[PDB]
Design a protein around this ligand. Sequence first.
Ligand SMILES: [Zn+2]
Ligand SMILES: [Zn+2]
Ligand SMILES: [Zn+2]
Ligand SMILES: [Zn+2]
Lengths: 132, 132
Amino acid sequence: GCSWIEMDGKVHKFTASHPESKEIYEKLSEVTRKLEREVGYVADTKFVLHNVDEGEKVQMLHGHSERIAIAYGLLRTPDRACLRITKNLRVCRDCHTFCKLVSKLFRRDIVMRDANRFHHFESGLCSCGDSW
Amino acid sequence: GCSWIEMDGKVHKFTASHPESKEIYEKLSEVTRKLEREVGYVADTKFVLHNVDEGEKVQMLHGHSERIAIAYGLLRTPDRACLRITKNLRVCRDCHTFCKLVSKLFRRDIVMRDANRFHHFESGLCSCGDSW
Ligand SMILES: [Zn+2]
Ligand SMILES: [Zn+2]
Ligand SMILES: [Zn+2]
Ligand SMILES: [Zn+2]
């Protein structure tokens, strides 16, 4: 599970969590805090335990790699700039809503190509009509 | 959270899980499998996560230390022998039922003194009347 952002032929990859910088995750924390304060949106925490009993580690079901890529793009690309995100998996439903809200809240188009579909987000809505 | 078993002035302590022997936990596995097959009893798995997100470890809410002590006593003490268990905590409800079923299924008295009460198990019932 990984995600790339394309900025005029510049590609950066994001997975998982070894931070490229700490200012990305603080940008991401302020963006997510914006979503809950502005529109009252909270994502759902999903995880697995391969065995519940006695000291197993928590494994998250969705890496949310594109969220980090979006935060990166809001830092390095100028305003109104289209964020171009690529994913090798199917975008999860919470991240799809995340992209919609960001595209409207921050007034930026987002062209996401996931494992099977091009998602063009603009002004809060997507080209796929929320069917993918 | 620990538990002691007293065998004629011989005291063994059990916590957590570094096994004294592997034959104790295989005795315990066969005893618990007896409880589900004979009387259809399954315990409830309770645990905590201090933070759900991203790789935290699972911490169990009840160590069930006396269960290991009981299995130990069924190995080293002869039949009909009273198992004397001490706990520094309050015996949990599932372990209290565990002690009741064992005292009837294996025909042994169990004198458990927990953090505040003497529990005398015999023939499936306890001296506390399931109020502790
Ligand atoms: Zn996601
Ligand atoms: Zn879409
Ligand atoms: Zn217990
Ligand atoms: Zn009792």
